[PDB]
Amino acid sequence: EDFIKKQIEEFNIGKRHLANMMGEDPETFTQEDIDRAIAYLFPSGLFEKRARPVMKHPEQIFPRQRAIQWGEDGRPFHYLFYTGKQSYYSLMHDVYGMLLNLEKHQRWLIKEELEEMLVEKLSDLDYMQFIRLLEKLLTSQCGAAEEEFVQRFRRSVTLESKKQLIEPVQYDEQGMAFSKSEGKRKTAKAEAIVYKHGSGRIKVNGIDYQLYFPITQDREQLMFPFHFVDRLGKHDVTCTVSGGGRSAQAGAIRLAMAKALCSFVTEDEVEWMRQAGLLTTDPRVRERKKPGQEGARRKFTWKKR
Amino acid sequence: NHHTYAELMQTLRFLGLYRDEHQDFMDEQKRLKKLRGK
Amino acid sequence: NEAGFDDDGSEFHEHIFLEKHLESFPKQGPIRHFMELVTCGLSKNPYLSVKQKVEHIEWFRNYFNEK
Amino acid sequence: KNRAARVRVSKGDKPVTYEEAHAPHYIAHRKGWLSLHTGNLDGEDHAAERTVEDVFLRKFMWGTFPGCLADQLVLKRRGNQLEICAVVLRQLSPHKYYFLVGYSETLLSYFYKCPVRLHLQTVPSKVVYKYL
Amino acid sequence: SFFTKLTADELWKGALAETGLNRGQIIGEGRYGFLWPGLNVPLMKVQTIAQRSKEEQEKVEADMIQQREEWDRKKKMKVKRERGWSGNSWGGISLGPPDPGPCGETY
Amino acid sequence: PVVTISDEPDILYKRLSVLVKGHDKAVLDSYEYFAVLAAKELGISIKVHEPPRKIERFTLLQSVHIYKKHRVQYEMRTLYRCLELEHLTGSTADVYLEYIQRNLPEGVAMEVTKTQLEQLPE
Amino acid sequence: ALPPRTEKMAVDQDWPSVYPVAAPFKPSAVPLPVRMGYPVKKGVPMAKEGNLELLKIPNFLHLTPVAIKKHCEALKDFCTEWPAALDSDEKCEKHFPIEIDSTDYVSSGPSVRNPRARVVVLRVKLSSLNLDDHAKKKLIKLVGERYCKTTDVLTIKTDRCPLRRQNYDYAVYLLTVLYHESWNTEEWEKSK
Amino acid sequence: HYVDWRMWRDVKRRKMAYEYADERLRINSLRKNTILPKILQDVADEEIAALPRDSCPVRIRNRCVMTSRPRGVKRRWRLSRIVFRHLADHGQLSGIQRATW
RNA sequence: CUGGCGGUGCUUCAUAUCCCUCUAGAGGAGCCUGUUCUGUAAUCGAUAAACCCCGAUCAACCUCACCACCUCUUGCUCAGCCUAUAUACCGCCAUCUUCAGCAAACCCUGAUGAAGGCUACAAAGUAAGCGCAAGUACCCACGUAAAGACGUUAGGUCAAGGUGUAGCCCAUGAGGUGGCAAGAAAUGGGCUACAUUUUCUACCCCAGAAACGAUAGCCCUUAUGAAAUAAGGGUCGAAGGUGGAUUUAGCA
Ligand SMILES: [Mg+2]
Ligand SMILES: [Mg+2]
Ligand SMILES: [Mg+2]
Ligand SMILES: [Mg+2]
Ligand SMILES: [Mg+2]
Ligand SMILES: [Mg+2]
């Protein structure tokens, strides 16, 4: 235990010297100085994130353990000292006493989290018994003080994934309600300019979509979003496609058009499109060619057989 | 060429400011074999 | 990179101007064309000097039309 | 398995250093680079001669001190500066230390046409990684 | 050559092989060295400069060989363990007592 | 300064194109940060970004004696920082490069400065 | 006694008087007990003073921000003015069309001989010149891989001599001779 | 003063090909050619056919120093992959690591 | 005494890993390529399990590291050995792993013996140290290069390279000079066709031959050399009509 204090004092002297280095007047600096140091005079470069130079006051990094467990002629800090982990059992006894008191009157954390909170290494069945006792307490006459005391060991709900980042209609640049977007499909990117009016054709890369992709699958993919939203003809575009080749560019244009549509579309249809699958990028992307194999995942023939 | 370099290493060893582990070990093994030889 | 790697001087008119310094054999075969090609290759190589190129041309002309 | 530079568990208080305990797939992850030389660079060329010179210097410096170099050096080329960071151990007296250091410095500076200098590792604790 | 050579770990683990010297000559001394004023002198405060010779170096090498022979002789440190009960068997013999525990009572 | 004050005309420098080359990411980051700090202290408007990386993964086996069904490579997470100074004088850039090289990062983080003169035609 | 300038060093001392020279880490002259190393299981990094990793770092402990500011104040000299000829890569070329490259790469190892300072290109913007009456039909053919459309980039890679400044001088002389010869075009240069 | 022998063979062959510079230079420059006369070409052919071994400029095989291995060698480091891998395993090379992509 | 075993009955169960299902290269065959081994003055590495496009990111004297003639016990080495002991090593690494734990130091269970430490309405584990877990970076966190513990084949190697010990010390080293490249026989790892898919052509998809595959080898050669290897021009222009229960990766 003395080594902990020795290292703490050594690092305190080191931090004093570090503060004395700078000739400025702010002694209670924040993480800015540590960041500047790691950027200038401590660039390790190790890929890992633990062995990197993260020098910090060990007053909070060095963990703590049970201090003294006895005083004048033994005398621990509780009557459940010989039971191992006296704190947990004392808390359980207090919970049982509160249970009996309430009876007379009338999300959860993980094991590691409870261990870090306390100073005991509890198992799983003891945690289950503690949860059972807490549930019995919450059920025994629903109040307020006890409910808050029990929730202290719990967290809020914090619901996510609900609304969609509605993009503005964008009326600047020109006198047309256009909207930027993008699309990805096996390493590819684009930037479309889907207007709001213009019930006619579409200019794909400055040229009509007749001499660009005579295949019907390309036109079907291009219609995918407009057909899903039912706003077919009433749309003009002057996108600039790049990267990919055929199906990649088709999917990129499809995603760009879907995003441009969702930009200025009712929340209902926006959510329907987002849930149908035509906004994000599927995981089907140019993977890493396996060096220990002939092709992609195709391993050698008589490997295990 | 390792000729001038070998001579420099030999001179350094003679001066007592170098170490030749593999060469000395091979020389000792050769001496032992000659004693057992031939 | 100035402390060395000078390769002597050229005076911006010594390495390329090789038309006169040629010693043209009686113009009747590809020997003159080959010598011109060699001079072009030497001029396109910035790793040579005036004396080196002169000696190379002299040795080439000798080994070719010694007779 | 792979024992490129690691040492599996055995006892508890055995001798072992940082370089004497690492995996091949952790050359740049949990382990650093003991030679930040101007050789294996990109797109810059010149690597063979640089590596040869680095190996020669490392072997010479290891042969200098007798029985005091556990790990290799960490050469540093700041243009025309050869900085050595040897893991030296307190051998005997400081007079011999200074004499040998000055002799080697002068010799290398007059030979390689570049200033050379080293510094001992006066630390009462090695860079032990795994307790083993 | 030397580039193709290696350090000492491989040679040691090959000569030993358990699975299935740096002490004699000092750096100050050499096979053909001379008296270096840098070391082998007092605190140097005023010093004397001199040089050795081939005969002196040969004498020093002979002395070092004699010291190595003496060390090799000392290496044969054999002791006859008191035969307990029977020979080549851990019979009746005392080693050491048990050290005190975390509480006390010197046993 | 202490560089023999002269009165002859100087050469018209323009664009000090630089390109750092290395392997380690933290070292390149530190080098580019120090360079940007020194440039800002000197007072030169510049831009910084990240050009495409250049990695030529050479070929090699995973073992030493005999092994093909299990292969490995030795790549690198190299980066590049084009710390180009747009329009400036030659003497200041030379002094800056001198101060840089007086203590440059060993091995990795190697700069490839490049200027662009002008002078008069004929 | 006499610790490694860690405890005996006076507190709040002039640090610029500690690392003024561009020195390395110096594990014995480092009053910063920085912890470096990967943990074992559930504890603290390894040693305290000089670590192998600390040395493996490119080493920038020398010259602290205070020393950096000192070096900057020292370098404050050399304040040569620069002309504001408008960027955009237009007026700069209009003023002087030629664009020579005189770089100074950094060498490696103990050898300064770096075969890389001989790069030179006479990238002269012909469009900026615009004084070719009949030489328009002559220059277009007297050079092969040049003469663009938007901006005439006459970049005749003249790297024949073993240097840079004399290479540029010879290139300028050849360009002047070519212009003087084109001033009086030939007789059969019209029909192409 | 090498330890192995293949290293010495390579050294001797390379130095013999480098020393006799003018001879092999002219030979390789004049032999296989469809232009110019054939007299000098035949002269060079006879010269290269009559001369003994340890001179022909076709004696270049990449090998290392630590092992003198011809299989799998690169001119960038003048050593083989095994030597390169052995040096990388000890963390003695910058930028080298596992294919993390 | 606790283990290997359970074609022991059974419990958790195997997600492409297994049968029921298939997507598909290869099986009958053209080309690059070697395996059991033949041959002299042209070794090859367990050349089964982990070799047969492995070392070879490749065999004209270098590369072949293998032998003889001019000479040696200074042989370029103040000699080395690519010579050997896998029953002695350093060295890299798959395998089981697509698991699940090993134990120092303690304290207990057998009238203390080979052993074990065993289940929350709790019947002895804290467990130094090595671990999945934390991913180490990325296409985020699945998935990729590689495991993932004490270990599994006196594991491959005395020769990828060095090495205890023995032998050469008229060599199995060699200073200078001369020597292969073909499958007697079978086979498989990669590019290819049996069909309009072999040719994609001015258009990558608005217009179609031989009615077959329409090879290799050889000559002119990009390169050079004392013997061709990837392939461009000419000739041959073949081998057999998915051919054996099928084989291996795949839950995008
Ligand atoms: Mg074997
Ligand atoms: Mg494995
Ligand atoms: Mg993991
Ligand atoms: Mg992997
Ligand atoms: Mg074995
Ligand atoms: Mg022989």
UniProtKB/Swiss-Prot annotation, chain C:
<protein>
    <recommendedName>
        <fullName>Small ribosomal subunit protein mS31</fullName>
    </recommendedName>
</protein>
<comment type="similarity">
    <text>Belongs to the mitochondrion-specific ribosomal protein mS31 family.</text>
</comment>
<comment type="subunit">
    <text>Component of the mitochondrial small ribosomal subunit (mt-SSU). Mature mammalian 55S mitochondrial ribosomes consist of a small (28S) and a large (39S) subunit. The 28S small subunit contains a 12S ribosomal RNA (12S mt-rRNA) and 30 different proteins. The 39S large subunit contains a 16S rRNA (16S mt-rRNA), a copy of mitochondrial valine transfer RNA (mt-tRNA(Val)), which plays an integral structural role, and 52 different proteins.</text>
</comment>
Curated annotation (Swiss-Prot), chain F:
<dbReference type="GO" id="GO:0005743">
    <property type="term" value="C:mitochondrial inner membrane"/>
</dbReference>
<dbReference type="GO" id="GO:0005759">
    <property type="term" value="C:mitochondrial matrix"/>
</dbReference>
<keyword id="KW-0689">Ribosomal protein</keyword>
<keyword id="KW-0687">Ribonucleoprotein</keyword>
<comment type="subunit">
    <text>Component of the mitochondrial small ribosomal subunit (mt-SSU). Mature mammalian 55S mitochondrial ribosomes consist of a small (28S) and a large (39S) subunit. The 28S small subunit contains a 12S ribosomal RNA (12S mt-rRNA) and 30 different proteins. The 39S large subunit contains a 16S rRNA (16S mt-rRNA), a copy of mitochondrial valine transfer RNA (mt-tRNA(Val)), which plays an integral structural role, and 52 different proteins.</text>
</comment>
<dbReference type="GO" id="GO:0005739">
    <property type="term" value="C:mitochondrion"/>
</dbReference>
<dbReference type="GO" id="GO:0005763">
    <property type="term" value="C:mitochondrial small ribosomal subunit"/>
</dbReference>
<keyword id="KW-0496">Mitochondrion</keyword>
<protein>
    <recommendedName>
        <fullName>Small ribosomal subunit protein uS10m</fullName>
    </recommendedName>
</protein>
<comment type="similarity">
    <text>Belongs to the universal ribosomal protein uS10 family.</text>
</comment>
<dbReference type="GO" id="GO:0032543">
    <property type="term" value="P:mitochondrial translation"/>
</dbReference>
Swiss-Prot record, chain G:
<keyword id="KW-0809">Transit peptide</keyword>
<keyword id="KW-0175">Coiled coil</keyword>
<protein>
    <recommendedName>
        <fullName>Small ribosomal subunit protein mS35</fullName>
    </recommendedName>
</protein>
<keyword id="KW-0496">Mitochondrion</keyword>
<dbReference type="GO" id="GO:0003735">
    <property type="term" value="F:structural constituent of ribosome"/>
</dbReference>
<dbReference type="GO" id="GO:0032543">
    <property type="term" value="P:mitochondrial translation"/>
</dbReference>
<comment type="subunit">
    <text>Component of the mitochondrial small ribosomal subunit (mt-SSU). Mature mammalian 55S mitochondrial ribosomes consist of a small (28S) and a large (39S) subunit. The 28S small subunit contains a 12S ribosomal RNA (12S mt-rRNA) and 30 different proteins. The 39S large subunit contains a 16S rRNA (16S mt-rRNA), a copy of mitochondrial valine transfer RNA (mt-tRNA(Val)), which plays an integral structural role, and 52 different proteins.</text>
</comment>
<dbReference type="GO" id="GO:0005829">
    <property type="term" value="C:cytosol"/>
</dbReference>
<dbReference type="GO" id="GO:0005743">
    <property type="term" value="C:mitochondrial inner membrane"/>
</dbReference>
<dbReference type="GO" id="GO:0005763">
    <property type="term" value="C:mitochondrial small ribosomal subunit"/>
</dbReference>
<keyword id="KW-0687">Ribonucleoprotein</keyword>
<dbReference type="GO" id="GO:0005739">
    <property type="term" value="C:mitochondrion"/>
</dbReference>
Swiss-Prot record, chain H:
<comment type="subunit">
    <text>Component of the mitochondrial small ribosomal subunit (mt-SSU). Mature mammalian 55S mitochondrial ribosomes consist of a small (28S) and a large (39S) subunit. The 28S small subunit contains a 12S ribosomal RNA (12S mt-rRNA) and 30 different proteins. The 39S large subunit contains a 16S rRNA (16S mt-rRNA), a copy of mitochondrial valine transfer RNA (mt-tRNA(Val)), which plays an integral structural role, and 52 different proteins. Interacts with LIAT1.</text>
</comment>
<dbReference type="GO" id="GO:0005761">
    <property type="term" value="C:mitochondrial ribosome"/>
</dbReference>
<protein>
    <recommendedName>
        <fullName>Small ribosomal subunit protein uS14m</fullName>
    </recommendedName>
</protein>
<dbReference type="GO" id="GO:0005739">
    <property type="term" value="C:mitochondrion"/>
</dbReference>
<keyword id="KW-1274">Primary mitochondrial disease</keyword>
<dbReference type="GO" id="GO:0032543">
    <property type="term" value="P:mitochondrial translation"/>
</dbReference>
<keyword id="KW-0687">Ribonucleoprotein</keyword>
<dbReference type="GO" id="GO:0005763">
    <property type="term" value="C:mitochondrial small ribosomal subunit"/>
</dbReference>
<dbReference type="GO" id="GO:0031965">
    <property type="term" value="C:nuclear membrane"/>
</dbReference>
<dbReference type="GO" id="GO:0006412">
    <property type="term" value="P:translation"/>
</dbReference>
<keyword id="KW-0225">Disease variant</keyword>
<comment type="similarity">
    <text>Belongs to the universal ribosomal protein uS14 family.</text>
</comment>
